[PDB]
Design an enzyme around this catalytic site. Structure first.
Site, PDB file in Angstrom:
ATOM      1  N   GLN B  11       0.821  -1.209   0.000  1.00 27.20           N
ATOM      2  CA  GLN B  11       0.000   0.000   0.000  1.00 27.20           C
ATOM      3  C   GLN B  11       0.857   1.262   0.000  1.00 27.20           C
ATOM      4  OE1 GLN B  11      -3.637   0.486   2.404  1.00 27.20           O
ATOM      5  NE2 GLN B  11      -2.614   2.209   3.417  1.00 27.20           N
ATOM      6  N   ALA B  12       1.774   1.382   0.964  1.00 29.02           N
ATOM      7  CA  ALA B  12       2.586   2.593   1.059  1.00 29.02           C
ATOM      8  C   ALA B  12       3.365   2.833  -0.229  1.00 29.02           C
ATOM      9  CB  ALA B  12       3.536   2.502   2.256  1.00 29.02           C
ATOM     10  N   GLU B  71      -2.874  -7.615  -2.347  1.00 31.31           N
ATOM     11  CA  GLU B  71      -4.312  -7.413  -2.315  1.00 31.31           C
ATOM     12  C   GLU B  71      -4.642  -6.290  -3.286  1.00 31.31           C
ATOM     13  OE1 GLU B  71      -6.739  -4.051  -0.592  1.00 31.31           O
ATOM     14  OE2 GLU B  71      -4.725  -4.591   0.098  1.00 31.31           O
ATOM     15  N   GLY B 144       3.183  -6.018   5.857  1.00 27.61           N
ATOM     16  CA  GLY B 144       3.602  -7.384   5.587  1.00 27.61           C
ATOM     17  C   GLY B 144       4.083  -7.573   4.160  1.00 27.61           C
ATOM     18  N   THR B 145       3.437  -6.896   3.209  1.00 20.99           N
ATOM     19  CA  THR B 145       3.894  -6.915   1.825  1.00 20.99           C
ATOM     20  C   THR B 145       5.102  -6.003   1.627  1.00 20.99           C
ATOM     21  OG1 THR B 145       1.641  -7.376   1.079  1.00 20.99           O
ATOM     22  CG2 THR B 145       3.217  -6.563  -0.560  1.00 20.99           C
ATOM     23  N   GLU B 254      26.101   6.853  -9.474  1.00 16.99           N
ATOM     24  CA  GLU B 254      26.632   8.079  -8.895  1.00 16.99           C
ATOM     25  C   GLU B 254      26.068   8.336  -7.502  1.00 16.99           C
ATOM     26  OE1 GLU B 254      27.346  11.101 -11.874  1.00 16.99           O
ATOM     27  OE2 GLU B 254      26.970  12.675 -10.386  1.00 16.99           O
TER      28      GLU B 254
END
Ligand code: GTP
Ligand code: ACP
Ligand code: GDP
Ligand code: E3Y
Ligand code: CA
Ligand code: MG
Ligand code: MG
Ligand code: MG
Lengths: 332, 437, 427, 54
Positions: B11-12, B71, B144-145, B254
């Site tokens: 999600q994040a 999900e 968790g993902t 770089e």
């Protein structure tokens, strides 16, 4: 209620500050490891500053300035003065000092002029006049240590012909106000000052502990400002304020203003205050010298109640207010 | 020109990816349908922006990006959102049941079943590259993902793309916006497994972004949308050198060369200024000296910590807007006299400076005001280890009781991976201490 | 993420029916299954609990079970009785006689396979089945004995799905038979091993709340079930409505259960309300928060100050300041930090839902995993031993084939559960 | 201040300022650890089904 934790059970000062906080009824003490505290009375070694100020909904304050050790370790203090332009190599109120690593570069350069002009040439680590005999002592020890010019002509109290050091307590609050407790204490030597042999050092080392004749002229070898001032008037025709205290305030202000950029918490996510112990040495000419700074000092039994109450008023209740001042504010 | 592929995990990572690509399109003049009028070479080219966008014969500029989540609800919002036309359906990958805030479920149970599919979709983008440089991987530490699947993906990328650089944008957990009580576990587990597969990682503490939104944007209770638009601005500042003409940080290699002298200490601190509210009707535009000085205030950092009490190993200043080198050097000379900026003894004391004249772009109707000049400082300071100390302490409290460990063991993980991961962190904290005292 | 709902026995079917009444109204569904609501947040996650039928009809994914037809006839006659799929009514005729052995071993065994047939049909239609929720009492025979038999068989066929229960604990203050401690003790043994999450709904607490707080001098089961349905609506809010969290049953278990056996939650609700009487002043966020943590608002008769919170989930419903909610929730933890274990950092999570429950402008639901729940199991363990030391009433059970040993085993496991809760209250 | 490697283009410029000089696992191993974990899951699940069969 305000919440606090106690992580240095060996602190007489903050043990007394605990009781005062509890006695207000507006402060609750938590267990050492509870993170939901307003105030930390932290340990003296490896205080976890990195874990402060990350508790949502809690303004957090701690009784130590991170980075203040640079001033409160003898080796670091000397480095701070020699390298900081605010204080400088030729600072007038710190004795000549050199940092010596024990398995000296320039110390011998000055000590060898000492033999040139035949001047006073006693130094301190532990006192001696011959370098190569204090260095046999430094290396047969283990740790680093500084060697500093021993002041041969100190101011001597009468009667007694005694040596002494002045301890000033200084509180620095979260706003970096510098508060000098109006009550000092002279830590006197019950022994007459002998300049003919420094191997016998009970008349040179003025520590209250190292005085195990102890208690003769005044209770506990502690002469406070009331009496010491009257003495300076009767004896020398001056006051404690004019002859000594001006220089002391100058020195305190100078030291603490020098490190303010490095230790200030003004824009930090947690806040700091700290109580310091400045130790001063007065010479024959009413000239003050800084000896060292203590970052975790103790007090005198007479002054615990007043000073600890002042810590609560100035350092704690200023941040956490509840539902004549004993300090002199050193301005900057 | 050398391509970069962005990968957004969990999600994040996905929602931050949305914010970044929206901003990228606005910065390059790319419309939501993928058209780019200013691009006169139709169907291809080796321009700087082609590092992040491929081109179709019809003039569509397509992000070199893959979105993956275990999900579908979050990526489903991308499939139907403003920029739905931007992405080919094959780059948006979703399962049906997530990792339930469980590193082991994302890394082992569920990750084993989708990893091959994800690598095949990544291979599809890699084959469109004439000279792929590496990957930019966006994810949370706490999900968790974001934790579990990312570490598995990073391992496989080292196998399939051994010579390719991999950079991370990692969201460090903050309780004010966090979702799970086990996020300290997932953070340490994923950091341990990923450490050797990441060349450079930019951590963003949600606590820092949250407070910046409250303090400087006057948002009483910031949302993910508030946080991600601010994060995307910082991410954009960091990647601008890859997308625009310039001499500094022009290839992923770089970044490591300029920011990371030792492999394990590869977490640069980002500091960004100025963050100004759009709602403020009266604003005084901050000079070069003021925004540069702001780069040394902890309140403007992506992770709250005190660089005065650590040592620097590298420092880059990335300006956007009305900035000329003379004013930068003048500002630096002043700052050096008033601040505690200590470098390690084996590193030169210097700033690498890059200036893009185009001022920062802001999304219309957003919270950020338009400013005349902005800067992102990337400094590799030992002070960032404070965040590891914080995370490891929380890990220790729960693990001493083995709280929640049964959920990870039940997914096929062994208890020893907890202590193995924690020992790696103990070594990492030790590294930062040796370099910083 | 579909949930399959199962209600077993008299109590299970009576609270189950009321639960479906309450959440059907919250989602804008009428007794005919047609949606006549106003907001689309009502439908965004409607599939969690409802199947969609011909003509845009919503059918609860609910299975109704009992060994006697009486209560289920009352449900099909009830206000929303016509909303359930008629095939999901599964009943025998002999009844269980408040006898766990009958529900678990004899009468229940004859009927359990046809219940599993309905469960299988409902599961096979599921896009991605989250798991199951069972409503039942522990003091009877069908919900207790057959309910735990179903749970065992459900776990055997779906070992990777979450099992959640709303379990009504018996109380001599609200008691039908003396053998309720026997039935409850045997059931708790099953729950400890075969559920992931169990809401402990204590008829003792429900009675005290109706009596002491709602000033009902002689509460009925209908009054008790008013508290139950309000609590069940609250604790499922994050499953039924789209929030910041996108919560499901597994995430709830992962974050609430630090040790697999300690998965028994104290529910709580605020403001506490009686039926057919509307109070008109809305509670401020400070008042909501303080009441939701008050022992008088807990649905399990346990003193939270007698233990420590391992984890807490709090849900606020209505239009309110989320900034004020954050401050008040932080206020509770900071001012009472000794009652939250320090070895699980930040163990209190909050969610907010804009839709308030019917009849209220603001509400707060509390889900606590507290070591003080051991007081509930100790209470039942004492009532169990008072009879079991004399083998009193045991013949009702040995007559169904059970042996005393099985009672001794259930007693020991529940006492183990008590001491395991005590272990973490001292840590 | 030493200003070095100044590069100017139409989009901006870059330069460096100096104040003071100085004083993997293979696919096979991944596949096995993923399979080892899966073995442990299936063992735990077989233990449960055995217990439920008893
Ligand atoms: N800054 C920011 N943080 C986010 C966002 N979404 C989630 N997080 C943070 O990420 C952590 C949770 O991880 P998620 O990414 O939501 O979880 P996930 O990667 O999808 O993994 P699972 O849902 O457990 O399968 C929490 O600490 C959140 O605060 C976002 O959009 N922006
Ligand atoms: N340069 C110097 N010249 C003269 N006397 C000195 C001196 N340095 C130290 N002394 C004397 O030695 C005594 C102890 O010195 P110092 O203060 O460094 O040790 P210490 O740290 O144990 C005491 P505290 O910690 O309380 O300040 C001082 O009281 C002083 O009388
Ligand atoms: N809260 C509540 N408890 C009930 C209700 N009906 C029965 N009980 C309790 O459940 C136990 C009796 O079990 P019951 O469900 O009637 O027997 P079963 O049909 O065999 O499952 C006793 O502890 C009753 O007090 C109800 O409607 N609400
Ligand atoms: C103690 O830490 C926790 C407790 C619970 C939860 C989480 C973390 C993370 C997401 C799942 N979760 C929740 N799940 C559900 Cl269904 N309803 C919740 N209502 C309120 C609050 C949380 C809820
Ligand atoms: Ca082109
Ligand atoms: Mg000392
Ligand atoms: Mg997710
Ligand atoms: Mg009954």
């Amino acid at each position: 209620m305000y919440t606090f934790v106690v992580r240095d059970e060996n602190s007489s000062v903050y043990a007394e500050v605990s009781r005062l906080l509890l006695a207000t009824g507006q402060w609750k003490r938590l267990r050492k490891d509870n993170p939901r505290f307003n105030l930390m009375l932290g340990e003296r070694n490896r205080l976890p500053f990195g874990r402060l100020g990350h508790e949502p909904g809690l303004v957090q304050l701690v009784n130590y300035y991170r980075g203040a050790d640079k001033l409160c370790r003898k080796a670091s203090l000397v480095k701070l003065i020699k390298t900081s332009p605010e204080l400088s190599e030729s600072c007038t109120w710190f004795p000549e000092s050199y940092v010596i690593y024990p398995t000296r570069e320039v110390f011998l350069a000055a000590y060898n002029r000492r033999r040139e002009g035949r001047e006073g040439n006693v130094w301190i680590a532990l006192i001696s006049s011959e370098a190569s005999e204090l260095l046999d002592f430094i290396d047969e020890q283990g740790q680093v240590h500084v060697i500093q010019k021993y002041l041969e002509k100190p101011l001597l109290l009468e009667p007694g012909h005694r040596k002494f050091d002045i301890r000033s307590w200084v509180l620095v609050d979260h706003l970096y106000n510098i508060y000098l407790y109006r009550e000092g204490v002279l830590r006197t030597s019950s022994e007459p000052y002998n300049s003919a042999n420094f191997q016998d050092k009970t008349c040179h080392l003025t520590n209250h502990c190292i005085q195990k004749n102890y208690g003769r002229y005044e209770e506990g070898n502690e002469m406070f400002f009331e009496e010491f001032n009257q003495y300076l008037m009767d004896a020398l025709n001056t006051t404690l304020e004019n002859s000594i205290l001006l220089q002391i305030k100058h020195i305190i202000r100078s030291c603490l203003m020098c490190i303010e950029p490095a230790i200030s918490t003004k824009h930090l996510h947690y806040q700091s205050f700290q109580l310091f112990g400045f130790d001063f040495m007065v010479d024959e000419e009413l000239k003050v010298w800084l000896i060292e700074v203590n970052g975790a000092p103790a007090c005198a039994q007479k002054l615990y109640a007043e000073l600890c109450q002042g810590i609560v008023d100035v350092a704690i209740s200023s941040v956490f207010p509840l539902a004549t001042s004993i300090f002199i504010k050193l301005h900057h | 020109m050398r391509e970069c592929i962005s990968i957004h995990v969990g999600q994040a990572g996905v929602q931050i990816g949305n914010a970044c690509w929206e901003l990228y399109c606005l910065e390059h003049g790319i419309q939501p349908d993928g058209q780019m009028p200013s691009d006169k070479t139709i169907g291809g080219g080796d321009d700087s922006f082609n590092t992040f966008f491929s081109e179709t014969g019809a003039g569509k500029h397509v992000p070199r990006a893959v979105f993956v989540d275990l999900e579908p609800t979050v990526i489903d919002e991308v499939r139907t959102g403003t920029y739905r036309q931007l992405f080919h359906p094959e780059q948006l990958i979703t399962g049906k049941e997530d990792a339930a805030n469980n590193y082991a479920r994302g890394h082992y149970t569920i990750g084993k079943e989708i990893i091959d599919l994800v690598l095949d979709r990544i291979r599809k983008l890699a084959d469109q590259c004439t000279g792929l440089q590496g990957f930019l991987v966006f994810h949370s530490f706490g999900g968790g993902t974001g934790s579990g699947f990312t570490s598995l993906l990073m391992e496989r990328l080292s196998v399939d793309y051994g010579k390719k650089s991999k950079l991370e944008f990692s969201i460090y957990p903050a309780p004010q916006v966090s979702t799970a009580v086990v996020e300290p576990y997932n953070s340490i587990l994923t950091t341990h497994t990923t450490l050797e597969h990441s060349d450079c990682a930019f951590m963003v503490d949600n606590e820092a972004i949250y407070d910046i939104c409250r303090r400087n944007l006057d948002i009483e209770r910031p949302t993910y949308t508030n946080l991600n638009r601010l994060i995307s601005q910082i991410v954009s500042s960091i990647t601008a050198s890859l997308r625009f003409d310039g001499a500094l940080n022009v290839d992923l290699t770089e970044f490591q060369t300029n920011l990371v002298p030792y492999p394990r200490i590869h977490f640069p601190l980002a500091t960004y200024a100025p963050v100004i509210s759009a709602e403020k009707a009266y604003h005084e535009q901050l000079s070069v000296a003021e925004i540069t000085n702001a780069c040394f205030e902890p309140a403007n950092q992506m992770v709250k910590c005190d660089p005065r009490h650590g040592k620097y190993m590298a420092c880059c200043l990335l300006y956007r807007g009305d900035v000329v080198p003379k004013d930068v050097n003048a500002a630096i000379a002043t700052i050096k006299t008033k601040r505690s900026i200590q470098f390690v003894d084996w590193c030169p004391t210097g700033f690498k400076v890059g200036i893009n004249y185009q001022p920062p772009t802001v999304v219309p109707g957003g919270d950020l005001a338009k400013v005349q000049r902005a800067v992102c400082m990337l400094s590799n300071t030992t002070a960032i280890a404070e965040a590891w100390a914080r995370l490891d302490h929380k890990f220790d409290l729960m693990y001493a009781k083995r709280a929640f460990v049964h959920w990870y063991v039940g997914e096929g993980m062994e208890e020893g991976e907890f202590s193995e991961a924690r020992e790696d962190m103990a070594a990492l904290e030790k590294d930062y201490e040796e370099v910083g005292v | 993420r579909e949930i399959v709902h199962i209600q077993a026995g008299q109590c299970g079917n009576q609270i189950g029916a009321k639960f479906w009444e309450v959440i059907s109204d919250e989602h804008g569904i009428d007794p005919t299954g047609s949606y006549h609501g106003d907001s689309d947040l009502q439908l965004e996650r409607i599939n969690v609990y409802y199947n969609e039928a011909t003509g845009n009809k919503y059918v609860p994914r609910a299975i109704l079970v009992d060994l006697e037809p009486g209560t289920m006839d009352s449900v099909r006659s009830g206000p929303f009785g016509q909303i359930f799929r008629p095939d999901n009514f599964v009943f025998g005729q002999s009844g269980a006689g408040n006898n766990w052995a009958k529900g678990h071993y004899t009468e229940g065994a004859e009927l359990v396979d046809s219940v599993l047939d309905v469960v299988r049909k409902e599961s096979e239609s599921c896009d991605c089945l989250q798991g199951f929720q069972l409503t039942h009492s522990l003091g009877g025979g069908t919900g207790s004995g057959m309910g735990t038999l179903l749970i065992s068989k459900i776990r055997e066929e779906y070992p990777d799905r979450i099992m959640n229960t709303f379990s009504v604990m018996p109380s001599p203050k609200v008691s039908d038979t003396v053998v309720e401690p026997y039935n409850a003790t045997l059931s708790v043994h099953q729950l400890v091993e075969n559920t992931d999450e169990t809401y402990c709904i204590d008829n003792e607490a429900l009675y005290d709340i109706c009596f002491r707080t709602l000033k009902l001098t002689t509460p009925t089961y209908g009054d008790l079930n008013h508290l139950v349905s309000a609590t069940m609506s609250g604790v499922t809010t994050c499953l039924r409505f789209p929030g910041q969290l996108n919560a499901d049953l597994r995430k709830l278990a992962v974050n609430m259960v630090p040790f697999p056996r300690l998965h028994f939650f104290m529910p709580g609700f605020a403001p506490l309300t009686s039926r057919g009487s509307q109070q008109y002043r809305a509670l401020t966020v400070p008042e909501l928060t303080q009441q939701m943590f008050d022992s008088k608002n807990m649905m399990a008769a346990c003193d939270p100050r007698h233990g420590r919170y391992l984890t807490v989930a709090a849900i606020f419903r209505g239009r309110m300041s989320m900034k004020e909610v954050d401050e008040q929730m932080l206020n509770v933890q900071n001012k009472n930090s000794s009652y939250f274990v320090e070895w699980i950092p930040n163990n209190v999570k909050t969610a907010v839902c804009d839709i308030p429950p019917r009849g209220l402008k603001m509400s707060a639901t509390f889900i606590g995993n507290s070591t003080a729940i051991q007081e509930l199991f100790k209470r039942i363990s004492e009532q169990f031993t008072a009879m079991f030391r004399r083998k009193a009433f045991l013949h009702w059970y040995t007559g169904e084939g059970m042996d005393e040993m099985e009672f001794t085993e259930a007693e020991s496991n529940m006492n183990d559960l008590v001491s395991e809760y005590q272990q973490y209250q001292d840590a | 201040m030493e200003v070095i490697e100044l590069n100017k283009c139409t989009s901006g410029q870059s330069f460096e300022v100096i104040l003071k000089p100085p004083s993997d696992p293979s696919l096979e191993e991944i596949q096995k650890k993923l399979e080892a974990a899966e073995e442990r899951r299936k063992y735990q699940e077989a233990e449960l089904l055995k217990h439920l069969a008893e």
